[PDB]
Swiss-Prot record, chain A:
Deletion consequences: Lethal when homozygous.
Subunit comment: Part of the augmin complex composed of 8 subunits. The complex acts on microtubules and interacts with gamma-tubulin in spindles and the phragmoplast.
Protein purpose: Involved in microtubules reorganization during spindle and phragmoplast development.
Location(s) in or outside the cell: Cytoplasm, Cytoskeleton, Spindle; Cytoplasm, Cytoskeleton, Phragmoplast
Protein name: AUGMIN subunit 4
Native source species: Arabidopsis thaliana (Mouse-ear cress)
Family membership: Belongs to the HAUS4 family.
From Swiss-Prot, chain B:
Places the protein is found: Cytoplasm, Cytoskeleton, Spindle; Cytoplasm, Cytoskeleton, Phragmoplast
Protein name: AUGMIN subunit 1
Quaternary data: Part of the augmin complex composed of 8 subunits. The complex acts on microtubules and interacts with gamma-tubulin in spindles and the phragmoplast. Interacts with AUG3.
Family, as annotated: Belongs to the HAUS1 family.
Phylogenetic placement of the source organism: Eukaryota, Viridiplantae, Streptophyta, Embryophyta, Tracheophyta
Top-level lineage group: Eukaryota
Record note on disruption phenotype: Lethal when homozygous.
Role: Involved in microtubules reorganization during spindle and phragmoplast development.
Gene that specifies this protein: AUG1
UniProtKB/Swiss-Prot annotation, chain C:
Signal sequence extent: none
Entries under Pfam families matching the protein: HAUS-augmin3
Gene name of the record: AUG3
Database matches in InterPro entries: HAUS3, HAUS3_N
Subcellular locations according to the entry: Cytoplasm, Cytoskeleton, Spindle; Cytoplasm, Cytoskeleton, Phragmoplast
Name by which UniProt lists this protein: AUGMIN subunit 3
Bilayer-spanning residue ranges: none
Lineage: superkingdom: Eukaryota
Disruption phenotype: Lethal when homozygous.
Family affiliation: Belongs to the HAUS3 family.
Swiss-Prot record, chain D:
Gene name of the encoded protein: AUG5
InterPro entries: AUG5_plant, HAUS5
Domain of life of the organism encoding this protein: Eukaryota
Function: Involved in microtubules reorganization during spindle and phragmoplast development.
Family: Belongs to the HAUS5 family.
Known partners and oligomeric status: Part of the augmin complex composed of 8 subunits. The complex acts on microtubules and interacts with gamma-tubulin in spindles and the phragmoplast.
Knockout or disruption consequences: Lethal when homozygous.
UniProt organism field: Arabidopsis thaliana (Mouse-ear cress)
Cell compartments where the protein resides: Cytoplasm, Cytoskeleton, Spindle; Cytoplasm, Cytoskeleton, Phragmoplast
Protein name (Swiss-Prot/TrEMBL): AUGMIN subunit 5
């Protein structure tokens, strides 16, 4: 174990001697901007999904507008399965809105 | 004693671990946390841009509702367009931002 | 003495090669050798620098070039058996990993110069034929031609 | 000297003043204060210019050589540049994460970029990197203009 390692250290030192010097000059001028240029792309998808809940909430809001229609039995029987459809209609629209924040 | 000298030559290499850390802690953490999320984002962005298409396929499965509702098709349509606008430029401006980092 | 001094001022290490045959080779420097006081004064101020070879002062200049900008040649080289095999294969790969990055640095920087001219010379082939009447049209092309090139260099 | 970058030039910074007042100190505690000194030095063709300065001038040819390394000795420390860009089984296991670690390092060698460092040691890093930024596209273009004069004709 004594001879097998500390040749371990020979590798890890060679693994460091160039790694520290090469990376430092490369990433540091670009490290801060490296994350940001995705972060700006991350937030724009995030804010779109936030309105997309709002649009989904608008679909909940129009359901509040469906409520004056919901009292009428004729369209209510249509509405209840459509609300069941609307319930299902959310998921594929929500699964759009869920990961877009992420 | 050369092997022992090589061992002594190892307790010279075991201290540039103790020379580089003042920059390595800057190297070991921030580039790693930055790269790992983007690599995780790489598969995640590949999943972000994709599920639109299965949802386009899934929207066909639930295509019945929007015509029945007063307005449901417009809401999904416009949000996709903003999403489409996200991949519309397709990092072309980001390249220019990447250009400033590259040169 | 001073006759060989003006022959000695150019260099000292390379001098002995001709320095043996030189006093037989030349006779005219002995004439201004005889005028020691006049020649000695100008030589005495200059002889500290003339003892150093003109190539040798460049050798000290390239000592700065050697550090961090060296263009000279670069060198690029049972359970405990499995750890031995692992250590055996990893160290060669890790050596290769640290040697491949050093195998390149000699020609690393030039690559963007290499592919750019390969793009650059290719366009130059036909523009060299007829470019006298329209240069202001041509100077527009070189602006956005490199835009493609910088995209390749950034990619 | 080599150990500390700030330590090396401070003897040198005073040296150009020192070397002449080393000639001004001989046979006098201070050059202005002591009357004994002013005869020792000569206004023209002084003895110091005869032997001491030529010995120093002989040294300068080697001093500028060691200073050239001394500037490198100072430069290396502030910025390092080299070639441009059961337990025994556990130790075998520990090598596996170590083997896993270099592949991350091998990947970490190009994860930021494999096109830029491999094709350019220094593109935007301080040395000449701002120069290509200062110019429109890259400092090579000046090597591309002199034959543009032949191109337009």
């Amino acid at each position: 174990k004594t001879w097998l390692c500390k040749r371990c250290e020979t590798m890890n030192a060679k693994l460091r001697v160039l790694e520290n010097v090469l990376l430092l000059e490369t990433y540091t001028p670009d490290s801060i901007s490296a994350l940001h240029n995705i972060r700006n792309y991350l937030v724009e998808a995030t804010e779109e999904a936030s309105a997309a809940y709002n649009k989904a909430v608008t679909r909940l809001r129009e359901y509040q507008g469906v409520d004056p229609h919901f009292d009428t039995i004729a369209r209510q029987y249509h509405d209840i399965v459509k609300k069941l459809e609307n319930m299902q209609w959310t998921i594929h629209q929500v699964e759009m809105d869920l990961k877009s924040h992420d | 004693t050369n092997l022992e000298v090589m061992a002594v030559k190892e307790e010279q290499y075991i201290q540039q671990y103790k020379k580089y850390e003042m920059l390595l802690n800057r190297v070991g953490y921030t580039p790693k946390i930055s790269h790992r999320e983007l690599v995780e984002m790489a598969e995640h962005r590949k999943e972000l841009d994709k599920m639109t298409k299965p949802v386009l396929d899934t929207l066909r499965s639930y295509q019945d509702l929007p015509p029945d509702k007063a307005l449901a098709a417009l809401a999904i349509e416009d949000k996709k367009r903003q999403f489409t606008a996200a991949e519309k430029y397709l990092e072309e401006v980001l390249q220019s931002a990447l250009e400033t980092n590259d040169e | 003495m001073s006759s060989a001094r003006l022959c000695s001022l150019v260099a000292e290490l390379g001098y002995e090669g001709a320095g043996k045959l030189d006093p037989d080779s030349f006779e005219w420097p002995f004439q201004y050798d005889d005028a020691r006081p006049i020649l000695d004064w100008i030589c005495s101020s200059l002889r500290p620098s003339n003892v150093l070879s003109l190539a040798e002062l460049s050798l000290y200049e390239q000592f700065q070039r050697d550090g961090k900008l060296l263009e000279g040649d670069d060198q690029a080289y049972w359970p405990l058996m499995k750890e031995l095999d692992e250590m055996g294969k990893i160290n060669s790969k890790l050596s290769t990993a640290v040697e491949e990055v050093t195998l390149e640095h000699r020609n690393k920087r030039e690559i963007v110069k290499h592919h750019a001219k390969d793009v650059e010379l290719q366009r130059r082939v036909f523009v060299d034929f007829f470019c006298n009447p329209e240069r202001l049209r041509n100077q527009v092309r070189e602006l956005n031609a490199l835009v493609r090139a910088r995209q390749a260099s950034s990619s | 000297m080599q150990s500390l970058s700030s330590s090396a030039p401070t003897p040198e910074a005073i040296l150009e003043w020192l070397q002449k007042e080393m000639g001004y100190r001989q046979l006098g505690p201070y050059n202005g204060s002591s009357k004994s000194h002013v005869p020792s030095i000569d206004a023209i063709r002084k003895i110091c210019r005869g032997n001491m300065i030529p010995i120093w001038n002989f040294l300068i040819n080697r001093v500028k050589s060691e200073k050239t390394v001394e500037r490198i000795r100072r430069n290396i420390t502030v910025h390092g540049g080299s070639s441009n860009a059961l337990p025994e089984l556990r130790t075998a296991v520990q090598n596996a994460q170590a083997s896993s670690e270099h592949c991350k390092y091998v990947r970490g060698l190009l994860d930021e970029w494999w096109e830029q460092p491999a094709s350019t040691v220094v593109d935007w890093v301080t040395v000449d990197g701002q120069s290509v930024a200062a110019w429109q596209n890259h400092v090579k273009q000046l090597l591309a203009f002199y034959d543009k004069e032949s191109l337009r004709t």
